[PDB]
């Protein structure tokens, strides 16, 4: 094809035909090609660290001996269920309810989901504090709607026959002896899911923020010993003096059920919380039978995952920064990190220029948009400081002890955040997750070193396509802070509106033309279908603005990178033209013909042949670069174009 007629078919015409989607894939994209390379290059890194033999105390030893304790499943059979019985004896030695709570927190430090979930995030009202959050997790089933809903009555009918068969595999004997205890478990989890919140109530952040003092928590949940619980977690009541109860009416009844239900019913319940947590880290009788309820009955999986697929997922859950640090000493070196800091600084300079020369917004709110970009951070690459795993011992011949110690060095790290203030470069995803977004509550882009891989950012090639590639994905995500979506968020992340009515109306009337452009677009594969499929242009309006504001800034940020010099021409291609060829190669994505019709109904992005082609029609720099005449398919008239920044 011709790039003035079809920019997408010029560089992906040799990819949309002669590349077939594999059978397990729904859609095979360039965003999904990085998922297959961040799961290969992490799996090839922990396999290499197991066959290396580093010194005891380093981090190539610690990931190398945790994965090799999982992959040697013959030594888990030699251990038996005897590592579980030493940890079940902590439940069985508990006479009163005080020692049952302190045994439960020692399980909860070591990786067992207890009765109250614990995570430590920021305050999000103060944001100079780290606070601890007391969620709901007291049930063995994934939702509240597996106990009362009539659709999920097949699961609760098959629930106590699974717990009786798992208790029979631990203590020995037949399932008729343990059907009495497994009916006491479901009768307590039904009483715990009576006070679970719904899914549509849990996302509402007005009732999901209830700041309590620790002296107020003991008077609220009277019937639980909270002091010996958090001491066994690895903290103190003078170390979490204020805390947020995420579900406050759940915590009143759960501590009321801790003192009203008999403690033998709670101890067989707490045995089951230990058994189904440690079920993938035990023998093949307990690995396979726990899959038959949790993968075959619930999710519907025909075969269990392999030992290496759960081996990498054990290392990634326990030590994500240790596998993060070795991913970026091989695949994202500091010459490629220092290359990408200039590119975001040029993108932050092009957003400083284009806001100041802007016409469609108020000059009182134009200075508000410069105050947000001065408060703008960018978590790009890897963190500036790693997390210390030096308090962690990993033995190669003990899989159950490593999971007890790897979950305890993660739980001691997040509960040590309560002493110091907020780092604000904490990096809640590791640098191998392919998830690049914009977080408006704290105002940054989070672009890890897996999205900064080719064909998005090749650091050895010419610098033109890195502005067209990851430099326009970044300007899409910086542009989500200055759109109609980002009008509700200021530079600190609070919910104040820095757009006036005039700005909203002008921005709406400028971007009114994109709805009539995108309503008349049909994917080339779905053109043959008898019922014409049309991109719902009023539904995909928020992402079509941001792809337009992403590319139009990265052409300016390329122009302030050359610093007056002409662009280098490689194989007859201008550097202004090579931004658009790097824009048209980050949407190497095809779908199946059945899934793409479902993509036009519910997916708020456009089809990926119209994120590329339907954005360069409205960019004035596309017409000068490719010499687009009047008789071309992407030739818009210049009065109907949408311009957001230039
Ligand atoms: Zn996106």
XYZ file of C-alpha atoms and ligand atoms in Angstrom:
647
model
C 0.000 0.000 0.000
C 0.807 3.740 -0.075
C 1.348 5.646 3.209
C -0.761 8.613 2.100
C -3.630 6.227 1.276
C -3.041 3.625 4.005
C -0.260 4.189 6.550
C -1.294 1.020 8.396
C -1.186 -1.155 5.284
C 2.189 0.228 4.217
C 4.196 -1.300 7.066
C 1.795 -4.032 8.264
C 0.736 -5.308 4.848
C 3.542 -7.842 5.198
C 2.262 -8.659 8.699
C -1.548 -8.788 8.501
C -1.420 -11.447 5.773
C 1.521 -13.753 6.515
C 1.260 -13.912 10.322
C -1.374 -16.267 11.722
C -2.720 -16.039 15.275
C -1.984 -19.093 17.469
C -4.880 -21.153 18.774
C -4.611 -20.184 22.452
C -4.589 -16.460 21.616
C -7.657 -14.275 21.273
C -5.733 -11.352 19.752
C -2.070 -11.291 18.720
C -0.717 -7.767 19.112
C 2.577 -5.954 19.502
C 1.386 -5.115 23.009
C 0.793 -8.857 23.409
C 4.119 -9.701 21.770
C 5.836 -8.105 24.761
C 3.898 -10.369 27.127
C 5.437 -13.399 25.411
C 8.916 -11.900 25.754
C 8.608 -10.740 29.357
C 7.510 -14.250 30.306
C 10.301 -15.912 28.322
C 13.190 -13.691 29.424
C 12.186 -13.898 33.090
C 11.802 -17.711 32.905
C 15.191 -17.989 31.169
C 16.702 -15.835 33.931
C 15.680 -17.921 36.960
C 16.574 -21.154 35.130
C 20.026 -19.627 34.507
C 20.307 -18.545 38.149
C 19.555 -22.103 39.307
C 22.306 -23.642 37.146
C 24.899 -21.046 38.234
C 25.560 -21.682 41.922
C 26.155 -18.241 43.393
C 27.366 -17.541 46.925
C 24.955 -17.676 49.856
C 23.817 -14.128 50.532
C 23.515 -12.830 46.979
C 20.358 -12.561 44.880
C 21.277 -14.894 42.035
C 21.464 -17.602 44.696
C 18.159 -16.596 46.280
C 16.074 -16.797 43.127
C 18.072 -19.790 41.914
C 17.402 -21.909 44.968
C 13.755 -20.906 45.415
C 12.839 -22.022 41.889
C 14.905 -25.200 42.200
C 13.159 -26.054 45.454
C 9.868 -25.924 43.538
C 11.053 -27.759 40.419
C 12.493 -30.664 42.440
C 9.115 -32.203 43.250
C 10.662 -35.519 44.320
C 12.105 -33.806 47.401
C 8.663 -32.438 48.259
C 7.389 -36.032 48.286
C 10.283 -36.987 50.578
C 9.226 -34.198 52.930
C 5.608 -35.307 52.667
C 2.830 -33.472 54.458
C 5.139 -33.389 57.528
C 6.154 -29.708 56.884
C 2.428 -28.914 57.031
C 1.996 -30.862 60.300
C 4.681 -28.782 62.005
C 2.719 -25.687 60.983
C -0.643 -27.304 61.783
C 0.752 -27.939 65.282
C 0.798 -24.169 65.865
C -2.988 -24.258 65.454
C -3.343 -27.384 67.609
C -1.235 -26.010 70.495
C -3.555 -23.005 70.908
C -5.679 -23.403 74.040
C -7.470 -20.054 74.320
C -8.559 -17.627 71.601
C -5.556 -15.376 72.286
C -3.049 -18.041 71.212
C -5.259 -18.919 68.232
C -5.014 -15.334 66.955
C -1.234 -15.145 67.449
C -0.833 -18.476 65.670
C -3.003 -17.111 62.850
C -0.883 -13.979 62.430
C 2.232 -16.152 62.250
C 0.469 -17.971 59.418
C -0.535 -14.608 57.948
C 3.034 -13.313 58.066
C 4.140 -16.534 56.375
C 1.650 -16.217 53.512
C -1.716 -17.619 54.614
C -4.870 -15.622 53.965
C -6.365 -15.289 57.427
C -9.610 -13.617 58.432
C -8.557 -10.008 57.792
C -6.472 -9.062 54.773
C -3.528 -6.701 55.276
C -1.819 -4.448 52.767
C 0.039 -1.168 53.232
C -0.525 1.621 50.702
C -0.566 5.409 50.952
C -3.141 7.464 52.820
C -4.509 9.185 49.618
C -5.777 12.126 51.726
C -2.487 13.009 53.425
C -0.004 11.221 51.057
C 2.955 11.772 53.419
C 1.870 8.671 55.364
C 1.841 4.955 54.786
C -1.146 3.359 56.492
C -2.270 -0.233 56.931
C -5.572 -1.387 55.430
C -7.837 -4.070 56.906
C -9.766 -5.644 54.021
C -12.135 -8.602 53.797
C -10.787 -12.101 53.151
C -12.380 -14.824 55.238
C -13.855 -17.188 52.676
C -12.439 -19.936 50.505
C -14.585 -19.029 47.474
C -13.735 -16.037 45.227
C -16.814 -13.815 45.709
C -19.644 -13.214 48.155
C -21.957 -14.529 45.380
C -20.871 -18.183 45.762
C -22.869 -18.643 48.977
C -26.235 -16.922 48.438
C -26.635 -16.655 44.649
C -28.663 -19.364 42.907
C -26.348 -19.423 39.869
C -23.436 -20.579 42.051
C -25.368 -23.294 43.905
C -23.487 -25.998 41.987
C -20.202 -24.792 43.499
C -21.455 -24.707 47.111
C -22.923 -28.188 46.591
C -19.469 -29.338 45.447
C -17.681 -27.259 48.117
C -17.815 -29.469 51.295
C -17.024 -32.630 49.348
C -13.739 -30.996 48.363
C -12.753 -29.876 51.880
C -13.530 -33.358 53.225
C -11.279 -34.875 50.576
C -8.475 -32.394 51.327
C -8.702 -33.002 55.087
C -8.644 -36.736 54.369
C -5.393 -36.349 52.444
C -3.721 -34.547 55.354
C -4.808 -36.425 58.474
C -5.351 -39.778 56.762
C -8.417 -41.969 56.502
C -11.590 -41.730 54.439
C -13.766 -38.769 53.527
C -16.707 -39.915 55.680
C -14.738 -39.123 58.850
C -13.964 -35.618 57.583
C -17.386 -34.729 56.174
C -18.385 -33.605 59.675
C -15.536 -31.083 59.867
C -16.008 -29.923 56.269
C -19.651 -29.100 57.004
C -18.494 -26.997 59.960
C -16.200 -25.036 57.644
C -18.862 -24.086 55.062
C -21.304 -23.182 57.849
C -18.723 -20.693 59.145
C -17.734 -19.276 55.739
C -21.423 -18.688 54.976
C -21.641 -16.737 58.233
C -18.518 -14.788 57.225
C -19.799 -14.012 53.713
C -23.037 -12.674 55.219
C -21.046 -9.526 56.080
C -18.876 -9.410 52.961
C -19.410 -6.352 50.810
C -20.481 -6.614 47.184
C -18.274 -5.919 44.166
C -20.153 -2.695 43.348
C -19.856 -1.528 46.969
C -16.127 -2.274 47.227
C -15.139 0.089 44.409
C -16.866 3.087 46.035
C -14.011 4.916 47.773
C -16.230 7.025 50.046
C -17.062 4.060 52.289
C -13.737 2.343 51.556
C -11.838 4.906 53.637
C -12.625 4.690 57.365
C -9.668 5.997 59.367
C -9.596 4.469 62.849
C -7.236 4.664 65.777
C -5.880 1.335 67.050
C -7.572 2.043 70.387
C -10.815 2.507 68.444
C -10.290 -0.789 66.588
C -10.208 -2.890 69.773
C -13.459 -1.285 70.921
C -14.965 -1.849 67.464
C -13.962 -5.473 66.958
C -14.410 -6.686 70.541
C -13.870 -10.445 70.555
C -10.595 -10.524 68.649
C -7.212 -10.043 70.301
C -5.746 -7.550 67.850
C -2.523 -6.896 69.795
C -1.086 -10.422 69.606
C -2.268 -10.674 66.002
C -0.249 -7.708 64.716
C 2.765 -8.601 66.883
C 2.979 -11.999 65.167
C 2.569 -10.182 61.841
C 5.749 -8.250 62.597
C 4.541 -4.882 63.886
C 3.138 -3.304 67.038
C 0.192 -1.144 68.164
C 2.706 1.711 68.575
C 3.815 1.146 64.964
C 0.353 1.412 63.346
C -1.284 4.077 65.487
C -3.862 5.028 62.838
C -5.373 2.710 60.270
C -8.065 2.473 57.610
C -10.711 -0.237 57.963
C -11.806 -0.909 54.383
C -14.970 -2.847 55.324
C -16.027 -1.723 58.802
C -19.253 -3.701 59.244
C -17.442 -6.888 58.231
C -14.925 -6.424 61.037
C -17.586 -6.061 63.741
C -19.267 -9.396 62.956
C -16.021 -11.334 62.276
C -14.686 -10.431 65.707
C -18.143 -11.179 67.086
C -17.961 -14.566 65.366
C -14.519 -15.142 66.911
C -16.071 -15.103 70.401
C -19.528 -16.620 69.745
C -18.711 -19.565 67.472
C -16.979 -22.364 69.418
C -13.195 -22.409 69.014
C -13.041 -25.971 67.686
C -15.102 -24.793 64.708
C -12.655 -21.919 64.208
C -9.643 -24.229 64.481
C -10.830 -26.573 61.726
C -11.571 -23.409 59.747
C -8.033 -22.129 60.418
C -6.719 -25.575 59.499
C -8.437 -25.183 56.123
C -6.963 -21.701 55.579
C -3.555 -23.293 56.136
C -4.313 -26.324 53.931
C -5.622 -24.561 50.816
C -2.894 -21.905 50.979
C -0.071 -24.460 51.214
C -1.753 -26.824 48.731
C 0.505 -25.893 45.722
C 3.610 -26.262 47.925
C 2.989 -29.833 49.097
C 2.746 -33.339 47.624
C 0.986 -34.444 44.429
C -2.050 -35.690 46.361
C -2.695 -32.115 47.526
C -1.470 -30.274 44.415
C -3.751 -32.169 42.033
C -6.875 -32.403 44.211
C -6.887 -28.667 45.011
C -6.801 -28.059 41.248
C -10.017 -30.100 40.784
C -12.049 -27.512 42.721
C -10.111 -24.325 42.061
C -9.217 -24.833 38.408
C -11.723 -27.347 37.055
C -14.888 -26.572 39.014
C -14.416 -22.805 39.388
C -12.394 -21.644 36.384
C -12.871 -24.643 34.088
C -9.313 -25.686 33.227
C -8.817 -29.104 31.659
C -5.183 -29.621 32.704
C -3.043 -28.267 35.524
C -0.298 -25.743 34.796
C 3.265 -27.004 34.581
C 5.840 -27.018 37.359
C 7.842 -24.280 35.630
C 4.788 -22.045 35.102
C 4.124 -22.083 38.837
C 7.858 -22.011 39.511
C 8.397 -18.627 37.859
C 5.161 -17.382 39.457
C 6.515 -18.379 42.874
C 9.730 -16.396 42.286
C 7.843 -13.392 40.838
C 5.453 -13.286 43.792
C 8.152 -13.705 46.445
C 11.071 -11.768 44.896
C 9.856 -9.474 42.138
C 12.609 -6.902 42.610
C 15.379 -9.520 42.666
C 14.134 -10.833 39.333
C 13.528 -7.181 38.427
C 17.137 -6.181 39.103
C 18.556 -8.979 36.979
C 16.083 -8.283 34.164
C 17.436 -4.733 33.878
C 21.091 -5.650 34.167
C 20.610 -7.707 30.988
C 17.755 -6.233 28.931
C 17.589 -2.555 29.987
C 21.191 -1.370 30.582
C 21.924 2.152 31.946
C 22.847 3.452 28.482
C 19.239 2.615 27.553
C 17.939 4.092 30.802
C 19.825 7.366 30.262
C 18.539 7.474 26.682
C 14.919 7.320 27.861
C 15.292 10.078 30.487
C 16.025 12.623 27.751
C 13.010 11.436 25.737
C 10.537 11.972 28.585
C 12.238 15.320 29.313
C 11.681 16.367 25.703
C 8.072 15.135 25.948
C 7.721 17.230 29.107
C 9.232 20.182 27.238
C 6.856 19.826 24.283
C 3.946 19.802 26.721
C 5.336 23.005 28.230
C 5.493 24.715 24.835
C 2.141 23.528 23.422
C 0.179 24.461 26.543
C 1.609 28.010 26.485
C 0.847 28.599 22.782
C -2.611 27.025 23.042
C -5.747 28.708 21.722
C -8.766 26.671 22.816
C -8.323 27.037 26.578
C -8.505 29.898 29.035
C -5.191 31.653 29.907
C -6.162 31.465 33.582
C -6.459 27.677 33.149
C -3.447 27.559 30.829
C -1.329 28.518 33.851
C -3.095 25.749 35.788
C -1.951 23.246 33.160
C 1.641 24.417 33.586
C 1.370 23.948 37.349
C 0.387 20.307 36.807
C 3.305 19.589 34.460
C 5.721 21.136 36.968
C 4.403 18.616 39.526
C 4.719 15.795 36.985
C 6.860 12.764 37.791
C 7.785 9.884 35.513
C 8.453 6.366 36.809
C 10.222 5.176 33.663
C 12.662 2.274 33.437
C 13.691 0.707 36.750
C 13.588 2.182 40.277
C 16.390 4.369 41.558
C 16.724 2.072 44.588
C 15.988 -1.625 44.881
C 14.428 -3.530 47.763
C 16.773 -5.295 50.165
C 16.424 -9.075 50.407
C 19.421 -9.466 52.740
C 17.238 -10.640 55.662
C 16.182 -13.709 53.658
C 17.607 -17.235 53.667
C 16.711 -19.557 50.784
C 17.531 -23.265 51.124
C 17.599 -25.411 47.984
C 16.313 -28.578 49.707
C 13.271 -27.146 51.524
C 10.441 -25.691 49.424
C 8.057 -25.243 52.357
C 10.563 -23.286 54.426
C 11.453 -20.912 51.592
C 7.782 -20.032 51.069
C 7.532 -19.497 54.841
C 10.554 -17.182 54.710
C 9.968 -15.510 51.344
C 6.450 -14.497 52.345
C 7.819 -13.279 55.676
C 10.493 -11.077 54.120
C 7.819 -9.501 51.913
C 5.500 -9.005 54.875
C 8.268 -7.521 57.027
C 9.190 -5.100 54.244
C 5.722 -3.610 53.649
C 5.149 -3.373 57.401
C 8.433 -1.466 57.800
C 7.048 1.307 55.576
C 5.035 2.680 58.531
C 8.147 4.197 60.165
C 9.464 6.393 57.368
C 7.449 8.646 55.073
C 6.313 7.945 51.515
C 9.123 7.289 49.041
C 6.945 8.369 46.022
C 9.213 6.247 43.769
C 8.114 2.980 45.329
C 7.272 1.148 42.032
C 4.273 -1.032 42.921
C 4.833 -3.048 39.735
C 8.134 -4.773 39.041
C 10.177 -3.837 35.909
C 9.020 -6.787 33.803
C 5.236 -6.325 33.882
C 3.893 -5.196 30.500
C 1.457 -2.616 31.863
C 2.109 1.026 30.950
C -0.469 3.490 32.214
C -1.048 6.897 33.797
C -1.933 7.100 37.480
C -3.908 10.335 38.006
C -4.128 9.969 41.786
C -0.378 10.528 42.097
C 0.318 12.113 38.627
C 2.934 9.997 36.904
C 3.424 7.618 34.059
C 4.602 4.139 35.063
C 6.525 2.676 32.125
C 8.589 -0.383 33.224
C 11.437 -1.941 31.267
C 9.193 -4.518 29.533
C 7.081 -1.960 27.651
C 10.344 -0.129 26.780
C 11.428 -3.105 24.601
C 11.268 -3.201 20.769
C 9.177 -2.462 18.662
C 8.338 0.365 21.099
C 11.830 1.561 22.111
C 14.949 0.211 20.417
C 17.818 2.111 22.099
C 20.488 1.212 19.520
C 18.591 2.464 16.449
C 17.894 6.026 15.315
C 16.127 8.315 17.769
C 13.234 9.185 15.412
C 11.214 5.981 15.834
C 11.610 6.026 19.627
C 9.575 9.237 19.608
C 7.081 7.618 17.260
C 7.089 4.407 19.293
C 7.215 4.712 23.085
C 7.445 8.525 22.790
C 3.876 8.705 21.501
C 2.569 6.073 23.932
C 4.070 8.238 26.708
C 2.498 11.399 25.257
C -0.804 9.536 25.137
C -0.402 8.854 28.847
C 0.848 12.350 29.727
C -2.047 13.616 27.569
C -4.543 11.745 29.754
C -3.674 14.247 32.492
C -4.575 17.270 30.362
C -7.672 15.896 28.604
C -11.312 16.017 29.670
C -10.506 12.925 31.748
C -7.558 14.696 33.372
C -9.525 17.873 34.027
C -10.709 16.330 37.314
C -7.148 15.778 38.595
C -4.625 18.446 39.590
C -0.862 18.015 40.047
C -1.147 16.407 43.480
C -3.908 14.001 42.406
C -6.854 15.530 44.278
C -10.350 15.774 42.800
C -10.509 19.456 41.911
C -11.629 20.724 38.507
C -9.107 22.990 36.783
C -11.218 23.298 33.624
C -13.969 25.941 33.420
C -17.207 25.518 31.378
C -15.716 27.534 28.456
C -12.697 25.147 28.266
C -15.000 22.074 28.288
C -17.272 23.518 25.525
C -14.328 24.627 23.315
C -12.511 21.302 23.730
C -15.799 19.506 23.038
C -16.540 21.506 19.878
C -12.981 21.026 18.612
C -13.150 17.268 19.225
C -16.752 17.005 17.996
C -15.383 16.229 14.528
C -13.722 12.991 15.714
C -17.100 11.365 16.456
C -18.312 11.775 12.865
C -14.943 10.559 11.554
C -14.937 7.401 13.668
C -18.591 6.448 13.218
C -17.902 5.857 9.497
C -14.989 3.410 9.985
C -15.247 -0.369 9.314
C -12.299 -2.788 9.946
C -10.990 -4.218 6.615
C -11.490 -7.837 7.857
C -15.108 -7.088 8.949
C -16.034 -5.164 5.721
C -17.282 -8.428 4.044
C -19.693 -9.181 6.958
C -23.375 -8.703 5.874
C -24.193 -6.506 8.900
C -21.803 -3.505 8.661
C -19.723 -3.119 11.885
C -19.084 0.562 12.781
C -16.579 1.900 15.370
C -18.845 3.390 18.057
C -17.238 6.828 17.764
C -19.073 8.298 20.742
C -17.828 5.372 22.855
C -14.201 5.438 21.649
C -13.893 9.227 21.861
C -11.691 9.324 24.975
C -8.935 7.195 23.475
C -9.085 8.737 20.008
C -8.374 12.158 21.478
C -5.440 10.759 23.446
C -3.895 9.002 20.469
C -4.254 12.302 18.604
C -2.698 14.270 21.448
C -0.035 11.605 21.825
C 1.321 11.768 18.285
C 1.028 15.552 17.890
C 3.246 16.188 20.924
C 5.878 13.575 19.986
C 6.393 15.359 16.660
C 7.125 18.565 18.574
C 9.334 16.731 21.091
C 11.290 15.262 18.200
C 11.724 18.782 16.797
C 13.198 20.074 20.051
C 15.524 17.055 20.176
C 17.298 17.841 16.898
C 18.073 21.388 18.235
C 18.051 23.116 14.854
C 19.912 20.360 13.019
C 18.295 18.589 10.052
C 17.084 15.060 10.622
C 19.287 12.167 9.410
C 17.910 10.493 6.291
C 18.134 6.683 6.311
C 17.139 4.823 3.080
C 15.377 7.888 1.682
C 13.267 8.419 4.817
C 13.062 11.807 6.536
C 13.152 11.811 10.349
C 9.768 13.536 10.338
C 8.516 10.567 8.298
C 10.180 8.042 10.621
C 8.083 9.222 13.562
C 5.012 8.065 11.630
C 6.567 4.715 10.733
C 7.322 4.257 14.417
C 3.713 5.197 15.103
C 2.431 2.624 12.620
C 4.447 -0.271 14.086
C 3.224 -0.137 17.696
C -0.191 -1.224 16.439
C 0.920 -4.488 14.850
C -2.282 -6.173 16.032
C -4.778 -8.467 14.348
C -7.762 -10.190 15.915
C -10.063 -13.024 15.006
C -13.183 -12.159 13.028
C -15.431 -13.266 15.893
C -13.552 -11.336 18.592
C -13.263 -8.074 16.610
C -17.064 -7.720 16.458
C -17.048 -8.084 20.250
C -14.228 -5.507 20.299
C -16.536 -2.978 18.620
C -19.160 -3.295 21.378
C -17.389 -3.194 24.743
C -13.682 -2.263 24.219
C -13.320 1.534 24.678
C -10.256 1.736 22.454
C -10.598 1.817 18.686
C -9.647 -0.992 16.333
C -5.858 -0.805 15.949
C -5.964 -0.009 12.230
C -7.870 3.166 13.137
C -5.697 4.227 16.034
C -2.939 4.491 13.433
C -4.804 5.658 10.320
C -7.533 7.629 12.071
C -5.098 9.864 13.947
C -2.672 10.921 11.199
C -5.560 12.442 9.219
C -5.916 15.146 11.884
C -2.171 15.850 12.227
C -0.842 18.724 10.114
C 2.710 17.318 10.192
C 1.556 14.171 8.365
C 0.695 16.118 5.213
C 4.026 17.948 4.911
C 6.043 14.782 5.532
C 4.416 12.400 3.043
C 3.253 15.056 0.480
C -0.409 14.068 0.664
C -2.318 15.398 -2.345
C -6.074 15.847 -2.876
C -6.789 12.374 -4.310
C -5.665 10.351 -1.274
C -7.746 8.209 1.069
C -6.471 9.806 4.288
C -6.684 13.314 2.810
C -8.923 15.306 5.090
C -9.896 18.851 4.314
C -8.041 21.231 6.697
C -11.206 22.832 8.131
C -12.631 19.565 9.506
C -9.427 18.399 11.222
C -9.032 18.194 14.985
C -6.042 19.881 16.597
C -5.561 19.625 20.349
C -2.108 21.085 21.003
C -0.513 22.623 17.903
Zn -3.970 2.515 25.733
